């Protein structure tokens, strides 16, 4: 409440416990800190075979396996 | 399949009738079967 909520980590998930005697959050020690989208995961393993039972976008369809070959970058939908 | 495999598809309303396609629509229409001659002289 007496400092500005201006670091580099606002808005994220994780609570930073941090040290600061200073107006801005920035300001603040690094702290403490109070399947895997980097290992492409699959259609499978995202969660989404709903959206790749049949790959057709538009008037396009893709006749392909689906589904546990099918990789999904970074875990993310578009 | 239906259009929704293949593309994307919007919703249409289809008031198409498939009367016109049955037996009673495609052959209950008079056709020549047969032509009889009876001349004069030949």
Redesign the interface.
């Known amino acids: 409440s007496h400092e500005n909520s201006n670091s580099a980590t606002e808005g994220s998930t994780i609570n930073y416990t941090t040290i600061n005697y200073y107006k801005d959050s920035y300001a603040a020690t690094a702290g403490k800190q109070s399947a895997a989208p980097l290992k492409s995961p699959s259609a499978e393993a995202c969660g989404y075979s709903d959206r790749v039972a049949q790959l057709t976008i538009g008037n396009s369809t893709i006749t392909t396996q689906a589904a546990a070959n099918i990789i999904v970058g970074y875990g993310e939908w578009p | 399949t239906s259009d ?5 598809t919007r919703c249409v309303l289809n008031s198409h009738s498939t009367a016109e396609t049955t037996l009673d629509s495609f052959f209950s229409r008079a056709g020549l079967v047969g032509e009889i001659d009876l001349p004069l002289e030949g």
């Open positions: 929704e495999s293949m593309i994307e």
